């Protein structure tokens, strides 16, 4: 278990040009294109990005060194945040990856606002009410075991709800 494997599991690899949640075009794990309506320029922006003419189309190669750039893009974002930096600086490894989790879900603006409950479902005197405060999210609520298999991560440090 690793992060890659943990959001193939929770995100999906596609390999063809797909439409998100929001109806943008997307590749690989959830990786967006372009909040363009249109489809070349969901195109170029592939083409560019691989560095070939793909035509919609990329490997499993490609997707994961897609996937690793944004990757070490979401870190570079986290350290920049005042707020989350901390939280970050503390997390082993495992805990670290369920938060590049959420980021990646929801980006540095809506895990933000979860500091705190975060803080805390590593602290035993809260722990209980961070998860019930978790829980009342919609963010839970549209996505249910995701957030589950989150939650758990960074509860245990253990990569366990993945197996």
């Given at each position: 278990?690793?992060?890659?494997?943990?959001?193939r599991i929770d995100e999906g690899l596609r390999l063809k040009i797909y439409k998100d949640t929001e109806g943008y075009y997307t590749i690989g794990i959830g990786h967006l294109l372009t909040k363009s309506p249109s489809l070349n320029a969901a195109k170029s922006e592939l083409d560019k990005?691989?560095?070939?003419?793909?035509?919609?189309?990329i490997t499993?190669?490609?997707?994961?060194?897609?996937?690793?750039?944004?990757?070490?893009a979401a870190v570079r974002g986290i350290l920049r945040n005042a707020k989350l930096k901390p939280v970050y600086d503390s997390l082993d490894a495992v805990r670290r990856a369920a938060?590049?989790?959420?980021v990646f879900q929801m980006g540095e603006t809506g895990?933000?606002?979860?500091?705190?409950?975060?803080?805390?479902?590593?602290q035993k005197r809260w722990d209980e009410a961070a998860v019930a405060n978790l829980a009342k999210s919609?963010?839970?609520?549209?996505?249910?075991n995701r957030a589950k298999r989150v939650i758990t991560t960074f509860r245990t440090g253990?990569?366990?709800?993945?197996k």
């Open positions: 278990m690793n992060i890659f494997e943990m959001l990005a691989i560095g070939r003419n793909t035509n919609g189309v499993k190669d490609e997707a994961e060194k897609l996937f690793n750039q944004d990757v070490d938060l590049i989790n959420m895990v933000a606002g979860f500091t705190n409950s975060l803080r805390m479902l590593q919609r963010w839970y609520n549209q996505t249910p253990t990569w366990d709800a993945y």
